[PDB]
């Protein structure tokens, strides 16, 4: 099917190029103009770097799909899989950290004077990059390169009992990459918006209510983008885990569209967090 291959390759390529361009632009603007003086800038740079690295592995799996095999070996297989599984968690944890940081900034201002410092931002970033290693390293060790009907596969292998480790890894990824992040994001942002409602210079006149509506809308957009981008892939992976489904063209396009949708979060993050805040847009209005 030529049309299906063209569509899937075009989807992967456009997601990859948009993500790379946006994230590299964000990193360049932070390094040159904005500078990493505040905690928010440090978090944004970390998110951009993680997103760029995560989206950098799109060409490899696009080639894997196109050629039906893995023409790279075993060391590069480990390097690509580990990078993917590692930057997933790094990006997600940076999102959760930004949510908690904003919640503390709004709802606990006095203690925010104590905690929200660039040094603490760097410590939290290092903690995130370390905690992502708990999935980066076991993946880098368990990654392998098998043979299936004369085709080279870049899949993963598990120890022994039936599997009981593939399902364990899937469950852990689902819980610590979808469920817990959604809980943290939603709770922190809901509390932040509830407190911002009572805040004085956000209520009252027409423009103050306009600012409150803008902030609430932006928060809702962030949460909705995360949920829309990440829910289908996890749900459909669970569906494949529990039950078996026929291999049709619709099944293949659903698989690859869900994967590309999951990666689209890394493409939308630079717009949501970097290009749609007053600091960066103020820097841009002054060029």
């Amino acid at each position: 099917s030529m049309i299906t291959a063209i569509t899937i390759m075009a989807l992967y390529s456009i997601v990859c190029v948009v993500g790379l361009f946006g994230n590299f632009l964000v990193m360049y603007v932070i390094v040159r103009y904005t500078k990493m003086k505040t905690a928010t800038n440090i978090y944004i740079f970390n998110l951009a770097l993680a997103d760029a690295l995560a989206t950098s592995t799109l060409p490899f799996q696009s080639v894997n799909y196109l050629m039906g095999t893995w023409p790279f070996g075993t060391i590069l297989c480990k390097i690509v899989i580990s990078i993917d599984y590692y930057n997933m968690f790094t990006s997600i944890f940076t999102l959760c950290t930004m949510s908690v940081d904003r919640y503390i900034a709004v709802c606990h201002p006095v203690k925010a004077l104590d905690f929200r410092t660039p040094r603490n931002a760097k410590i939290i970033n290092v903690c995130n990059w370390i905690l992502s290693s708990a999935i980066g390293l076991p993946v880098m060790f368990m990654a392998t390169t098998k043979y299936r009907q004369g085709s080279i596969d870049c899949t993963l292998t598990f120890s022994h009992p039936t599997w009981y480790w593939e399902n364990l890894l899937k469950i852990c990824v689902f819980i610590f990459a979808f469920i817990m992040p959604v809980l943290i994001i939603t709770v922190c942002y809901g509390l932040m918006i509830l407190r911002l409602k009572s805040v004085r210079m956000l209520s009252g006149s027409k423009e103050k209510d306009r600012n409150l509506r803008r902030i609430t809308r932006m928060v809702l957009v962030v949460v909705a983008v995360f949920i829309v981008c990440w829910t289908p892939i996890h749900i459909y992976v669970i569906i494949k885990a529990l039950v078996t489904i026929p291999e049709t063209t619709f099944q293949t396009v659903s698989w690859h569209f869900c994967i590309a949708l999951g990666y689209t979060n890394s493409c939308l993050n630079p717009v949501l967090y970097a290009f749609l805040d007053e600091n960066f847009k103020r820097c841009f209005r002054e060029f």
């Binding site: 894997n64 690509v80 899989i81 997933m88 870049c154 899949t155 993963l156 992976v237 698989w255 994967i259």
Partner: peptide, 5 residues
């Protein structure tokens, strides 16, 4: 997530 894999 989740096409190697």
């Amino acid at each position: 997530y989740x096409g190697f894999x």
